[PDB]
Amino acid sequence: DQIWDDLRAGIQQVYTRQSMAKSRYMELYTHVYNYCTGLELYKRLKEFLKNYLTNLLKDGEDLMDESVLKFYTQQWEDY
Amino acid sequence: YALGSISVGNLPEYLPFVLQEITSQPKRQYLLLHSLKEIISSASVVGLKPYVENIWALLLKHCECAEEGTRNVVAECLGKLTLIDPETLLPRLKGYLISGSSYARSSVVTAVKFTISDHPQPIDPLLKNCIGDFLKTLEDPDLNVRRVALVTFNSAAHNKPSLIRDLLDTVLPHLYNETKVRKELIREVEMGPFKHTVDDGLDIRKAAFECMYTLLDSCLDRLDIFEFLNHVEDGLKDHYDIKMLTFLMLVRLSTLCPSAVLQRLDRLVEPLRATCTTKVKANSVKQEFEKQDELKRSAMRAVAALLTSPLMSEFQSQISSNPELAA
Numbered sequence: 001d002q003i004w005d006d007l008r009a010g011i012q013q014v015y016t017r018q019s020m021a022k023s024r025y026m027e028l029y030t031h032v033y034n035y036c037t038g039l040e041l042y043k044r045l046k047e048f049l050k051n052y053l054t055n056l057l058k059d060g061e062d063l064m065d066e067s068v069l070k071f072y073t074q075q076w077e078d079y
Numbered sequence: 080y081a082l083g084s085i086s087v088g089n090l091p092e093y094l095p096f097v098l099q100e101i102t103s104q105p106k107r108q109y110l111l112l113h114s115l116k117e118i119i120s121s122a123s124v125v126g127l128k129p130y131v132e133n134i135w136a137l138l139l140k141h142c143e144c145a146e147e148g149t150r151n152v153v154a155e156c157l158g159k160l161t162l163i164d165p166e167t168l169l170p171r172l173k174g175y176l177i178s179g180s181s182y183a184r185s186s187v188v189t190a191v192k193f194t195i196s197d198h199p200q201p202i203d204p205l206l207k208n209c210i211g212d213f214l215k216t217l218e219d220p221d222l223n224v225r226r227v228a229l230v231t232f233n234s235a236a237h238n239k240p241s242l243i244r245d246l247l248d249t250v251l252p253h254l255y256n257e258t259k260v261r262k263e264l265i266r267e268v269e270m271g272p273f274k275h276t277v278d279d280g281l282d283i284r285k286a287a288f289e290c291m292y293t294l295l296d297s298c299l300d301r302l303d304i305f306e307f308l309n310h311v312e313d314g315l316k317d318h319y320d321i322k323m324l325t326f327l328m329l330v331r332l333s334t335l336c337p338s339a340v341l342q343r344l345d346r347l348v349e350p351l352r353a354t355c356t357t358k359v360k361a362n363s364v365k366q367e368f369e370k371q372d373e374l375k376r377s378a379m380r381a382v383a384a385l386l387t388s389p390l391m392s393e394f395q396s397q398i399s400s401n402p403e404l405a406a
Contacts, residue, residue: 014270
């Protein structure tokens with residue numbers, strides 16, 4: 001909870017299509033290992049995922065057939 | 080649909096209303112356009128003669144739109160409207176191809192795609208003469224133009240293959256060239272041990288393979304076999320969907336010209352054996368395991384169909400339990 005801000009934006013970085021070096025991946029793994037060595041994190045991650053899906057649905061509610069299948073495909077691939 | 084049907088009743092009082100309403104609101108035209116699609120398919124042609132220039136101008140103005148669905152709708156509307164008075168529109172469509180933009184060219188080629196019908200139509204000779212330059216000299220410059228041209232060619236072959244009967248050889252080199260893979264159009268992003276490759280040109284390859292498969296109906300007597308199976312041999316090692324499509328092609332080819340298939344079975348199966356000798360990547364989700372399993376089953380089915388001795392006896396301890404599941 002103390003370093004809750006740390007890695008916060010990182011949760012979005014994986015979702016956004018942007019290139020990231022292996023150094024950042026090592027740093028995130030090190031932070032996760034340090035934090036692990038505590039069930040509130042699971043609930044927080046679940047709530048964040050639910051909020052992200054709700055935000056995605058908010059935009060994906062005004063498209064008809066033949067124009068939403070591709071969008072759903074790319075969104076599923078990214079998820 | 081109700082609005083479109085009602086517009087047919089009193090064209091002078093309804094058609095202009097919807098025409099101006101389309102331009103009035105941008106958040107509703109997407110529906111209104113659909114209604115217009117009914118008018119051309121429901122309204123009397125003789126009564127529709129006066130209201131043609133306005134519709135054509137509106138479609139051309141709305142042809143270049145950011146929304147892909149709107150572009151499809153306008154393309155279908157233009158294709159449906161092209162049926163009437165072809166002698167007055169065909170030269171204009173030909174002219175637009177001399178200096179039109181990529182989006183305009185894509186829209187116009189998509190419009191004529193729907194003009195083809197299984198039953199005879201009075202636009203038979205006109206379309207036969209017009210499709211020449213559309214199919215021949217419109218696959219070089221662009222990627223989207225190439226994809227739409229290939230889709231139109233496949234649709235024509237599936238519905239009416241007589242139009243591409245006298246010019247099949249004139250377009251064979253371009254179709255064969257389009258099958259080659261391009262490594263400039265393959266982007267990759269890596270952020271750790273995992274890897275994911277995204278291809279921006281895979282759509283064209285699938286269309287080309289589908290066209291090649293559908294060309295087997297009543298065109299094998301003309302196209303040569305040796306120059307045709309080399310590209311298939313190259314494409315055996317390709318994407319999963321293309322791999323299954325090629326396997327099904329090979330299965331279908333078992334009953335057709337078996338001599339040619341037997342004369343090269345060795346090199347046809349060598350890539351297939353190499354693929355079958357593949358192992359699932361360690362520490363992978365069950366989806367990859369299942370995908371490779373279906374690929375292996377499809378490969379076994381393909382080889383079994385082809386069989387009906389380049390080291391064909393390779394039944395190890397595990398693979399020996401697979402065939403009873405396939406047969």
